[PDB]
Design an enzyme around this catalytic site. Structure first.
Site, PDB file in Angstrom:
ATOM      1  N   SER A  44       0.804  -1.214   0.000  1.00  0.00           N
ATOM      2  CA  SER A  44       0.000   0.000   0.000  1.00  0.00           C
ATOM      3  C   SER A  44       0.841   1.271   0.000  1.00  0.00           C
ATOM      4  O   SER A  44       0.269   2.371   0.009  1.00  0.00           O
ATOM      5  CB  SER A  44      -0.959  -0.007   1.196  1.00  0.00           C
ATOM      6  OG  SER A  44      -1.975  -0.997   1.044  1.00  0.00           O
ATOM      7  N   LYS A  47       0.321   3.356  -3.157  1.00  0.00           N
ATOM      8  CA  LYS A  47      -0.865   4.185  -3.199  1.00  0.00           C
ATOM      9  C   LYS A  47      -0.528   5.622  -3.543  1.00  0.00           C
ATOM     10  O   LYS A  47      -1.362   6.341  -4.104  1.00  0.00           O
ATOM     11  CB  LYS A  47      -1.615   4.132  -1.870  1.00  0.00           C
ATOM     12  CG  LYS A  47      -2.875   3.269  -1.969  1.00  0.00           C
ATOM     13  CD  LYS A  47      -3.471   2.908  -0.616  1.00  0.00           C
ATOM     14  CE  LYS A  47      -4.434   1.765  -0.751  1.00  0.00           C
ATOM     15  NZ  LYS A  47      -3.754   0.448  -0.869  1.00  0.00           N
ATOM     16  N   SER A  91      -5.549   3.157   3.609  1.00  0.00           N
ATOM     17  CA  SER A  91      -4.935   2.068   2.843  1.00  0.00           C
ATOM     18  C   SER A  91      -5.993   1.179   2.196  1.00  0.00           C
ATOM     19  O   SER A  91      -5.827  -0.038   2.104  1.00  0.00           O
ATOM     20  CB  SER A  91      -4.003   1.225   3.727  1.00  0.00           C
ATOM     21  OG  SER A  91      -2.633   1.436   3.434  1.00  0.00           O
ATOM     22  N   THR A 182       1.908   3.688   5.091  1.00  0.00           N
ATOM     23  CA  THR A 182       2.259   2.337   5.511  1.00  0.00           C
ATOM     24  C   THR A 182       1.971   1.320   4.413  1.00  0.00           C
ATOM     25  O   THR A 182       1.139   1.537   3.527  1.00  0.00           O
ATOM     26  CB  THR A 182       1.482   1.947   6.764  1.00  0.00           C
ATOM     27  OG1 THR A 182       0.089   2.145   6.520  1.00  0.00           O
ATOM     28  CG2 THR A 182       1.891   2.795   7.946  1.00  0.00           C
ATOM     29  N   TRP A 184       2.010  -3.268   3.954  1.00  0.00           N
ATOM     30  CA  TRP A 184       2.162  -4.541   4.650  1.00  0.00           C
ATOM     31  C   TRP A 184       1.697  -5.648   3.723  1.00  0.00           C
ATOM     32  O   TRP A 184       0.495  -5.774   3.469  1.00  0.00           O
ATOM     33  CB  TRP A 184       1.365  -4.544   5.939  1.00  0.00           C
ATOM     34  CG  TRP A 184       1.616  -5.736   6.783  1.00  0.00           C
ATOM     35  CD1 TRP A 184       2.205  -6.915   6.405  1.00  0.00           C
ATOM     36  CD2 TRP A 184       1.302  -5.870   8.166  1.00  0.00           C
ATOM     37  NE1 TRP A 184       2.267  -7.770   7.471  1.00  0.00           N
ATOM     38  CE2 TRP A 184       1.725  -7.148   8.566  1.00  0.00           C
ATOM     39  CE3 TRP A 184       0.704  -5.028   9.110  1.00  0.00           C
ATOM     40  CZ2 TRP A 184       1.567  -7.600   9.865  1.00  0.00           C
ATOM     41  CZ3 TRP A 184       0.553  -5.478  10.395  1.00  0.00           C
ATOM     42  CH2 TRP A 184       0.980  -6.748  10.763  1.00  0.00           C
ATOM     43  N   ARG A 224       5.278  -0.393  13.455  1.00  0.00           N
ATOM     44  CA  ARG A 224       6.070   0.357  12.492  1.00  0.00           C
ATOM     45  C   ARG A 224       6.276   1.789  12.952  1.00  0.00           C
ATOM     46  O   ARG A 224       7.323   2.374  12.666  1.00  0.00           O
ATOM     47  CB  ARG A 224       5.420   0.318  11.107  1.00  0.00           C
ATOM     48  CG  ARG A 224       5.329  -1.080  10.480  1.00  0.00           C
ATOM     49  CD  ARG A 224       4.392  -1.134   9.245  1.00  0.00           C
ATOM     50  NE  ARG A 224       2.972  -0.984   9.581  1.00  0.00           N
ATOM     51  CZ  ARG A 224       1.978  -0.992   8.693  1.00  0.00           C
ATOM     52  NH1 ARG A 224       2.233  -1.151   7.400  1.00  0.00           N
ATOM     53  NH2 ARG A 224       0.720  -0.844   9.098  1.00  0.00           N
TER      54      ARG A 224
END
EC number: 3.5.2.6
Length: 238
Positions: A44, A47, A91, A182, A184, A224
């Site tokens: 993501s 993005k 996200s 972020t 993942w 994170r």
């Protein structure tokens, strides 16, 4: 000093690098500094480049509202009507997949290879190539990207770039502004976790970074940020 960051990564039993770039001088920190030039899928984090390509090519605008047509989604705060801006803070994959399908392979590939992002190969399924490849990008390349974005140096109209930048704000405490996104990939092994942004410092100085770390499915998302915050304090960027 580079020695002590090894404490935070030793101790969170993870394995990742924290790349930092302040005006071309790039400095690694972490406990597995070899990831810096290993290609991972973006997840993501991509993005950000998706938004640009969309906004810029006018497949949308910061005001278009994306309508939730009933289907069940990964998280629950995703089952609602939302704009690109909010789809960003959350996200929310299915939005940007729509956007991607709007952009379409050819446009999508050409602008990716134009920007030269990662290996710049997206294969065929234009709506997944950043979550399970073939697109991969090394943490070094990510901080330099998000660098250029913060300095508005990306091959996009500045008005677009400023717009994207307005989605990515994450904390505005003490005259410090922190931007980032972020990522993942829980669906590949070992899982990669991202976190790529920058500090707009009080004096306006800009400090890009790119936390890459190896994830396991049991850690909380705020692992994170637990790392990055207390990191940027050791480096004294806050």
């Amino acid at each position: 000093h580079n020695q002590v960051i090894h404490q935070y990564f030793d101790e969170k039993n993870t394995s990742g690098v924290l790349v930092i770039q302040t005006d071309k001088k790039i400095n690694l920190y972490g406990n597995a500094l070899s990831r810096a030039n290993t290609e991972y899928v973006p997840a993501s984090t991509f993005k950000m480049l998706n938004a640009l390509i969309g906004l810029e090519n006018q497949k949308t605008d910061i005001n278009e509202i994306f309508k939730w047509k009933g289907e069940k989604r990964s998280a629950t705060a995703w089952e609602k009507d939302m704009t690109l801006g909010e789809a960003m803070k959350l996200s929310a994959v299915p939005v940007y997949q729509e956007l991607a399908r709007r952009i379409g392979l050819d446009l999508m590939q050409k602008e990716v290879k134009r920007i030269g992002f990662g290996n710049a190969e997206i294969g065929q399924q234009v709506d997944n190539f950043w979550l399970v490849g073939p697109l991969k990008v090394t943490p070094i390349q990510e901080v330099e990207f998000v660098s250029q974005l913060a300095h508005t140096q990306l091959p996009f109209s500045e008005k677009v770039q400023a717009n994207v930048k307005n989605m990515l704000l994450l904390e505005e405490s003490n005259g410090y502004k922190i931007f980032g996104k972020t990522g993942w990939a829980a669906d590949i092994k070992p899982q990669v976790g991202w976190l790529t942004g920058w500090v707009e410092q009080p004096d306006g100085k800009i400090v890009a970074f790119a936390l890459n770390m190896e994830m396991r499915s049991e850690m909380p998302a705020s692992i994170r940020n637990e790392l990055l915050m207390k990191s940027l304090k050791q480096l004294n960027i806050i």
